[PDB]
Write an enzyme that holds these catalytic residues in place. Structure first.
Site, PDB file in Angstrom:
ATOM      1  N   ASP A 275      -6.929  -5.254  -2.456  1.00 32.79           N
ATOM      2  CA  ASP A 275      -7.701  -4.187  -3.065  1.00 32.79           C
ATOM      3  C   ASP A 275      -9.098  -4.656  -3.452  1.00 32.79           C
ATOM      4  O   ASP A 275     -10.061  -4.140  -2.890  1.00 32.79           O
ATOM      5  CB  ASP A 275      -6.905  -3.453  -4.151  1.00 32.79           C
TER       6      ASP A 275
ATOM      7  N   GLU B 180       5.070  -7.827  -9.605  1.00 25.36           N
ATOM      8  CA  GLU B 180       4.141  -7.564  -8.528  1.00 25.36           C
ATOM      9  C   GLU B 180       3.288  -8.816  -8.252  1.00 25.36           C
ATOM     10  O   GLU B 180       2.950  -9.102  -7.111  1.00 25.36           O
ATOM     11  CB  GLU B 180       3.348  -6.316  -8.932  1.00 25.36           C
TER      12      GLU B 180
HETATM   13  C1  LIG Z   1      -2.794   4.237 -10.385  1.00 28.28           C
HETATM   14  C2  LIG Z   1      -1.515   4.685  -9.680  1.00 28.28           C
HETATM   15  C3  LIG Z   1      -0.463   5.215 -10.431  1.00 28.28           C
HETATM   16  C4  LIG Z   1       0.712   5.639  -9.811  1.00 28.28           C
HETATM   17  C5  LIG Z   1       1.854   6.195 -10.697  1.00 28.28           C
HETATM   18  C6  LIG Z   1       1.689   6.782 -11.975  1.00 28.28           C
HETATM   19  C7  LIG Z   1       3.020   7.097 -12.436  1.00 28.28           C
HETATM   20  C8  LIG Z   1       3.862   6.670 -11.391  1.00 28.28           C
HETATM   21  O1  LIG Z   1       3.144   6.152 -10.416  1.00 28.28           O
HETATM   22  C9  LIG Z   1       0.837   5.509  -8.414  1.00 28.28           C
HETATM   23  C10 LIG Z   1      -0.220   4.982  -7.657  1.00 28.28           C
HETATM   24  C11 LIG Z   1      -1.397   4.566  -8.294  1.00 28.28           C
HETATM   25  N1  LIG Z   1      -2.520   4.006  -7.534  1.00 28.28           N
HETATM   26  C12 LIG Z   1      -2.382   3.654  -6.131  1.00 28.28           C
HETATM   27  C13 LIG Z   1      -1.601   2.331  -5.911  1.00 28.28           C
HETATM   28  C14 LIG Z   1      -1.778   1.200  -6.734  1.00 28.28           C
HETATM   29  C15 LIG Z   1      -1.040   0.002  -6.480  1.00 28.28           C
HETATM   30  C16 LIG Z   1      -0.140  -0.065  -5.389  1.00 28.28           C
HETATM   31  C17 LIG Z   1       0.662  -1.374  -5.024  1.00 28.28           C
HETATM   32  N2  LIG Z   1       0.192  -2.042  -4.041  1.00 28.28           N
HETATM   33  C18 LIG Z   1      -1.123  -2.655  -4.246  1.00 28.28           C
HETATM   34  C19 LIG Z   1      -1.491  -3.724  -3.153  1.00 28.28           C
HETATM   35  O2  LIG Z   1      -2.822  -4.188  -3.337  1.00 28.28           O
HETATM   36  C20 LIG Z   1      -1.382  -3.202  -1.812  1.00 28.28           C
HETATM   37  O3  LIG Z   1      -1.641  -4.341  -0.879  1.00 28.28           O
HETATM   38  C21 LIG Z   1      -0.022  -2.692  -1.643  1.00 28.28           C
HETATM   39  O4  LIG Z   1       0.231  -2.318  -0.283  1.00 28.28           O
HETATM   40  C22 LIG Z   1       0.319  -1.521  -2.667  1.00 28.28           C
HETATM   41  C23 LIG Z   1       1.767  -1.105  -2.444  1.00 28.28           C
HETATM   42  O5  LIG Z   1       2.539  -2.207  -2.850  1.00 28.28           O
HETATM   43  C24 LIG Z   1      -0.001   1.080  -4.574  1.00 28.28           C
HETATM   44  C25 LIG Z   1      -0.717   2.256  -4.832  1.00 28.28           C
END
Ligand SMILES: Cc1cc(-c2ccco2)ccc1NCc1ccc(CN2C[C@H](O)[C@@H](O)[C@H](O)[C@H]2CO)cc1
Length: 765
Positions: A538, A735
């Protein structure tokens, strides 16, 4: 005979608790069919149940922990749930029983035990919620003898084209049913199992919590209307006991109230199979699944020193089961921007402002429907398919059950459009959407993600070169079947390869850039001032400002990964012309990595950009990015560049912490700045790549053999111990890990590529 193996895989995998977004629920791998879900919550007052009820997975102060203790998607598993708020320890056992023509039968035991802190007489509401979608489908609750609800089992009889005839039974169960002495009991009974059979438009059936509360609210309204008031109120638990009204419909709510400990069974009997499934069947088949899980674990995940102890085994079983237990079936529409706006080309300086203007046109629309069968990063936070994550998820899963892994790969590749794009984040259907903030739902056809699924394919290929038990490896044991799978998938792999070269092209020819090849150069689309989400890393520091002349070394290395895969698969299929092209591309990438990306001054690979004065500049931020040609297996064992990379990897003042490799060097100006996502923390996926490559050099005659052997031994130990220590203290896979303290941080329940740790422990790559 490939077709025969296919049919058997279908029937074997059809049923599962493939709803990892909730604590416990079942569905088959069919878009519009029968689904189940479990709900529970203590009730102590007239208003608390709305706050205590559990359904969708979360992580907070109120929930100590949960996960699968054992799981195989062919057999079933046992899950544990530690709920502090509700003072309950819950077990959900699920087992599958082959037979008939519709994917066979299944059964579940739900067992709840009060913890030590709970009042011994706590009242707990339990709901089993059943819905069925389909135009020509039926489901009907068999009515009770008794006046007000059920003394014994609730029997639902259903039929669909997909399922044929079936019966689903919710047994009476064991435990104290509270009894009310109130007047209301003359009209509602003293307390018993109840069923409401409802119908709603199919597209809302997934909304179980709202549907349930709507019925509870109707119940309460009835009380008020019929003069039950605060001058003499019924007990809370009777106030929230639904009036019994079973029938036909596409929603059935089965509700029980227990006082103290409880348990009950769900029996799904496929009519086209033998006789109906019993509780005795359940118990015996659960015992059997545990024995089989145990024996396979010991063969497939033989933990090598110093992790051969019983504590490391328990740790390994927990990590693995959570990973494979996370497998879901998702169905519905994706949100995609199909405008192909020209702003998305990013050929201009400031391209990110243009791209934002284009996004603000909101041309995106729903499309599909699509289906996906995939493991997931996280139940409480990320219960959906992510493209480069699934690459890492499938490495351990493939060891367990190569046939299951190829199924999931096929599932992913069937999502590919005619261009060669697969969306990096697969949010299929309103249920899946419910968890994702609007800002994050739209997929963009110019956004790539690392092609990690190719790694899994490489492992398959090497295995291919060198009844549940039979099915799990059919694809390597019958070389005819393996080749056939490759024959069909191969074109899609080529399409994706070409897609990368067309959409993620970098720009050599338009600047003062000399290099061996004029073709090989790459740039991730989709970067913002502070981010490059598409690369997976990211907030890893990249050239500032972002610029159309940027080149990304990680991306080039992924392309190398792909072309190596295609050479190995192409050879197998005798695609001579293809192999020769791939061979020229490998050669080219090999040279161009050096000419455009290698920094002699800094002794590592760097991203590149274009100066204030339109000249090529290396931008070096020492960290995972710097190691990529190595992490991806592109360097010769005897390479001097490899030499310098191993020095960086081993250097305590740069990347090497007691707890694993840092995402970014302590010496980088961006160390521990902004959100610090990939700017210092230790990530298990990349560490895993390092570990495998180190071992590779350690097991070959060459000049770095011994250096590598040392780093492999230490890194393996550091990574495993950090994950294990955290798991011991907290219950959780995390994570990422803090390189100063070793503490897990960010998101819990990340199983998730953290689970690669079982594969690290079992070693012998
Ligand atoms: C801010 C937020 C809140 C919620 C939420 C609120 C209540 C429940 O859910 C869901 C999504 C989001 N933001 C997007 C996100 C952020 C982090 C990830 C994890 N992760 C990051 C890695 O950097 C990637 O490489 C990897 O592929 C990826 C998947 O593991 C995936 C997506």
């Amino acid at each position: 005979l490939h077709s025969e193996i296919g049919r058997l895989n279908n029937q074997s995998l059809l049923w599962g608790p493939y709803r990892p977004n909730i604590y416990f629920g079942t569905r088959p791998r069919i878009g519009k069919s029968l689904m189940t879900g479990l709900m529970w919550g203590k009730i102590e007052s007239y208003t608390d149940f709305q706050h205590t009820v559990r359904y969708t997975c979360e992580q907070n102060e109120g929930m100590k922990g949960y996960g699968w203790d054992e799981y195989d998607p062919r057999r079933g598993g046992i899950q544990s749930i530690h709920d502090i708020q509700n003072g309950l320890d819950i077990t959900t056992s699920f087992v599958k029983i082959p037979g008939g023509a519709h994917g066979g039968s299944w059964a579940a035991r739900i067992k709840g035990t009060l913890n030590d802190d709970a009042p011994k007489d706590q009242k707990t509401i339990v709901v089993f919620y059943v819905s069925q979608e389909g135009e020509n489908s039926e489901l009907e609750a068999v009515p009770s003898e008794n006046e007000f609800g059920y003394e014994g089992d609730v029997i639902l009889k259903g039929r669909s084209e997909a399922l044929g005839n079936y019966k689903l039974v919710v047994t009476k169960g064991k435990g104290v049913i509270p009894q009310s002495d109130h007047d209301l009991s003359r009209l509602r009974g003293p307390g018993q199992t109840v069923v409401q059979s409802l119908t709603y438009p199919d597209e809302v059936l997934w909304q179980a919590k709202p549907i349930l509360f709507q019925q509870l609210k109707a119940g309460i309204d009835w009380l008020v209307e019929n003069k039950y008031d605060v001058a003499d109120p019924p007990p809370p638990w009777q106030v929230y006991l639904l009036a019994n009204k079973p029938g036909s419909g596409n929603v059935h709510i089965v509700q029980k109230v227990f006082e103290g400990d409880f348990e009950f069974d769900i029996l799904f009997s496929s009519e086209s199979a033998g006789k109906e499934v019993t509780s005795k069947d359940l118990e015996r088949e659960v015992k059997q699944a545990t024995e089989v899980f145990g024996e396979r674990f010991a063969r497939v995940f033989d933990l090598k020193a110093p992790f051969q102890g019983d504590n490391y085994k328990k740790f390994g079983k927990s990590m693995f089961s959570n990973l494979i237990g996370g497998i879901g079936y998702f169905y519905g529409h994706s949100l995609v921007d199909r405008s192909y706006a020209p702003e998305y080309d990013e050929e201009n300086e400031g391209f990110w402002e243009d791209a934002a203007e284009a996004r603000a046109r909101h041309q995106e629309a729903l499309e599909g429907p699509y289906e996906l069968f995939t493991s997931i990063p996280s139940r409480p936070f990320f219960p959906r398919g992510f493209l480069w994550d699934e690459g890492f998820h499938l490495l351990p899963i493939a060891d367990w059950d190569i046939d299951l892994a190829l199924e999931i790969i096929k599932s992913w590749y069937n999502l590919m459009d005619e261009d060669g794009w697969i969306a990096r984040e697969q949010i299929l259907g309103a249920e899946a959407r419910s968890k994702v903030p609007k800002e994050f739902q739209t997929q963009y056809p110019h956004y790539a993600n690392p092609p990690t699924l190719f790694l899994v394919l490489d492992n398959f290929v090497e295995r291919l070169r060198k009844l549940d038990e039979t099915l799990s490896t059919a694809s390597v044991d019958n070389p005819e079947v393996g080749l056939e799978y490759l024959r069909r998938l191969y074109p899609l792999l080529r399409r994706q390869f070409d897609w990368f070269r067309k959409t993620q092209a970098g720009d050599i020819k338009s600047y003062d850039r000399e290099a061996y090849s004029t073709k090989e150069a790459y740039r991730w689309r989709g970067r913002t001032v502070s981010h490059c989400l598409t690369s997976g890393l990211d907030d890893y520091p990249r050239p500032q400002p972002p610029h159309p002349g940027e080149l990304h070394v990680d991306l080039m290395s992924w392309v190398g990964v792909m072309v190596k895969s295609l050479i190995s698969i192409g050879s197998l299929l005798g695609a001579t012309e293809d192999v020769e092209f791939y061979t020229k591309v490998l050669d080219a990438i090999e040279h161009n990595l050096d000419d455009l990306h290698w920094s002699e001054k800094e002794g590592c690979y760097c991203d590149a950009t274009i100066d204030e004065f339109e000249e090529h500049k290396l931008v070096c931020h020492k960290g995972y990015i710097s190691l990529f040609p190595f992490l991806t297996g592109l360097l010769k064992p005897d390479s001097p560049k490899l030499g310098k990379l191993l020095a960086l990897i081993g250097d305590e003042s740069e990347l090497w912490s007691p707890y694993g490799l840092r995402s970014l060097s302590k010496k980088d100006e961006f160390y521990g700045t902004a959100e610090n996502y990939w700017r210092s923390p230790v990530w298990i996926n990349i560490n895993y790549l390092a570990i495998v490559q180190l071992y590779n050099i350690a097991t070959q005659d060459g000049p770095y053999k011994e250096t590598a052997r040392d780093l492999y031994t230490r890194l393996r130990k550091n990574i495993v111990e950090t994950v294990y220590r955290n798991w011991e203290e907290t219950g959780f896979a995390w994570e990422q890990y803090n390189p100063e303290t070793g503490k897990g941080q960010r998101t819990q329940h990340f199983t998730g590529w953290t689970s690669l740790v079982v594969k690290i422990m079992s070693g012998h790559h």
